[PDB]
């Protein structure tokens, strides 16, 4: 019997998801360490899955007896519990990713928002809207019995049988799959962008003229220069597309000019064509220009200057004319440890002086720039260094999202085809429905197994609890 196989599968899924999701609800409530923001969202996934793995034995016995014998009260609780598992589950996963977005993309502007009282308040809102969403299931859960006396537990819609069917699946498809995945996946888009634009991606090594310029392209944002020159050179690492909100970080392990050299951030806009500098250290010559004012940023104090370069080479060609905005520190910045340039502060300052930058952002790099000199410099460059702790958690949610999509999409795909349908179901199609549904039920015993493979903290808690051996 395909019932025999199906009943067996139901039952092993249930056994495994009960162990899996009880352990997960345990370790989070039993350890202080395990109570975290992501974990608070995770507990509710496990609660919903647990609630559901409890109803499964009844559904298993329906398949094995081809008959619902438990009564109308237990049917209502199983349908509510099966519905909870379809909507509360992913509604927990959407809130989980929005949380991931906010903590990577906007770590600064939503720290107050990311507190456990707000997680707990939010997670009582995840239930309220699930129960609102599954109200058709709750209200209309009941027994339908065929002419041969066998009752099946289902949702007896009030009208004609398929009338509410096409209505219902499209409701469920839109609430339980479309809208939440639309939300989820663009959360990870914007996260991919902030992760991808954090490190430097542009290497510049432009030696004009005579002398010696040995430029080294190291790992990450590292580079060094060794020069004793007679020309002009610019070496540095940065971003092919600059930003007026990027806060640039760097560390100049060596900044030893003998002669004319600048340590400086610099870049271009077009529309209008402007080259800009934020100079932090120099050699024997502090660059100036037409004085304009001062700005205080990142501990230190800079003068603002403008210059105009006539018939000079630019990113727009060999013979353009353009303005240059400068922020030159009034004294040489100490070197050797992590130093920040909060670029906005310079943009705002130039703006208040009527120096506006362009619409169209070209490159933006943290360069060593020498002018007929010698010297050495070693500089590492970056922007918004990621927290390794946070990386692994954002990786785990991404994969829990992945298995969910994998385990449920054949189901919504099977359900949406089935409205168009014109022929009565075939055994092959019937066996496909039961496989596709088993795929969804299996989803609620994966999450825990994944927590043990993708979270170290979950792995040791599981080992602590089941008295296993911790061997570094």
């Amino acid at each position: 019997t395909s019932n025999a196989v199906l009943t067996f599968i139901y039952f092993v899924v249930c056994i495994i998801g009960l162990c899996g999701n009880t352990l997960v609800i345990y370790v989070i409530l039993r350890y202080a360490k395990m109570k975290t923001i992501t974990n608070i969202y995770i507990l509710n996934l496990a609660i919903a899955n647990e609630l559901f793995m409890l109803g499964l034995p009844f559904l298993a016995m329906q398949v094995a007896l081809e008959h619902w014998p438990f009564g109308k009260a237990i049917c209502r609780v199983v349908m509510t519990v099966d519905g909870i598992n379809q909507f509360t589950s992913i509604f927990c996963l959407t809130v989980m990713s929005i949380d991931r977005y906010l903590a990577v993309v906007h770590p600064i502007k939503s720290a107050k928002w990311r507190r456990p009282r707000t997680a707990k308040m939010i997670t009582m809102a995840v239930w309220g809207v699930s129960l609102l969403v599954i109200l058709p299931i709750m209200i209309y859960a009941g027994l339908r019995s065929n002419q041969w006396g066998r009752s099946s537990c289902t949702i007896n819609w009030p009208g004609e049988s398929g009338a509410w069917y096409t209505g219902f699946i499209i409701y469920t498809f839109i609430l339980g799959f479309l809208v939440p995945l639309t939300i989820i996946c663009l959360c990870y888009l914007f996260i991919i962008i902030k992760v991808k634009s954090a490190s430097t991606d542009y290497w510049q090594n432009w030696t004009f003229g005579g002398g010696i310029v040995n430029a080294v392209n190291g790992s990450g944002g590292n580079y060094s220069v060794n020069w004793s020159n007679t020309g002009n050179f610019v070496v540095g690492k940065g971003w092919t597309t600059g930003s007026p909100f990027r806060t640039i970080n760097y560390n100049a392990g060596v900044w030893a000019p003998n002669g004319n050299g600048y340590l400086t951030l610099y870049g271009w806009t077009r529309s209008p064509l402007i080259e800009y500098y934020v100079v932090d250290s120099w050699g024997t010559y502090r660059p100036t220009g037409t004085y304009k004012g001062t700005v205080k940023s990142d501990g230190g104090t800079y003068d603002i200057y403008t210059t105009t370069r006539y018939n000079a080479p630019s990113i727009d060609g060999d013979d353009t004319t353009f303005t240059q905005y400068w922020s030159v520190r009034q004294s040489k910045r100490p070197t050797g440890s992590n130093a920040t340039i909060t670029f906005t502060n310079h943009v705002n300052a130039w703006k208040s002086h009527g120096m506006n930058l362009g619409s169209n952002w070209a490159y933006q790099v943290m360069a060593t720039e020498g002018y007929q000199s010698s010297g050495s410099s070693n500089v590492t460059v970056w922007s918004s260094k990621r927290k390794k702790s946070e990386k692994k958690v954002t990786r785990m949610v991404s994969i829990v999202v992945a298995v969910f999509i994998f385990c449920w999409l054949p189901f919504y795909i099977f359900n949406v085809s089935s409205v168009s349908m014109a022929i009565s179901p075939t055994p092959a199609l019937k066996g496909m429905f039961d496989f596709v549904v088993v795929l969804t039920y299996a989803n609620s015993c994966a999450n825990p197994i994944l927590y043990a493979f993708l979270d170290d903290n979950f792995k040791k808690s599981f080992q602590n609890v089941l008295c296993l051996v911790k061997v570094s």
């Binding site: 395909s2 099966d82 099946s152 179901p425």
Partner: peptide, 8 residues
């Protein structure tokens, strides 16, 4: 379709 998330 079937009766609910099962075709027997």
């Amino acid at each position: 379709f079937x009766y609910x998330k099962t075709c027997x």
